[PDB]
Ligand binder design. Structure first.
Ligand SMILES: C[C@@H](N)C(=O)N1CCCC[C@@H]1C
Length: 150
């Protein structure tokens, strides 16, 4: 009973979380997952500031109100070569990665590793935070509050 959460650097408190190496997070699960990191879904303004500090990914993820990809450099296979906060317009499907915003993180680029999941609750799952440099932090718990997400 295990969940892997791959996380990035934070940029003005915003970071990306990919669950189990595939698009697998619902909008309700995303809010609960950010809450376990003492974080919230970013606002579009928070995401635009993160972008300006150096944040980009090549994966769709929830923010408040939309599903987006922050892009700095044009790449043909990432958001159809767009730059800026690219907003997903048309999709049949509902499951993506998520972004999260931690207000207590540093104001600019923070590429230190994530070493805690401070607000998860009691439960049976082994949750492992996997950093880009491979360092890992694991704890037994749960973060999903909606049974349909379990
Ligand atoms: C200690 C710090 N690197 C950390 O582990 N966190 C803050 C950044 C967002 C997620 C997590 C709560």
């Amino acid at each position: 009973n295990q969940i892997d959460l791959n996380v990035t650097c934070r940029y003005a408190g915003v970071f990306h979380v990919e669950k189990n190496g595939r698009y697998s997070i619902s909008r309700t699960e995303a809010a609960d997952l950010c809450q376990a990191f003492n974080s919230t879904l970013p606002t579009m303004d928070q995401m635009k500031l993160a972008l300006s500090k150096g944040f980009e990914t090549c994966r769709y993820g929830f923010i408040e109100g939309n599903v987006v990809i922050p892009r700095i450099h044009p790449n043909a296979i990432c958001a159809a070569n767009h730059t800026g906060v690219y907003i997903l317009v048309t999709s049949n499907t509902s499951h993506y990665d998520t972004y999260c915003f931690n207000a207590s993180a540093p104001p600019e680029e923070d590429c230190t590793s994530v070493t805690d999941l401070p607000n998860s609750f009691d439960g049976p799952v082994t949750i492992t935070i996997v950093n880009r440099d491979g360092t890992r932090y694991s704890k037994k718990g749960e973060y999903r509050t909606h049974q349909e997400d379990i």
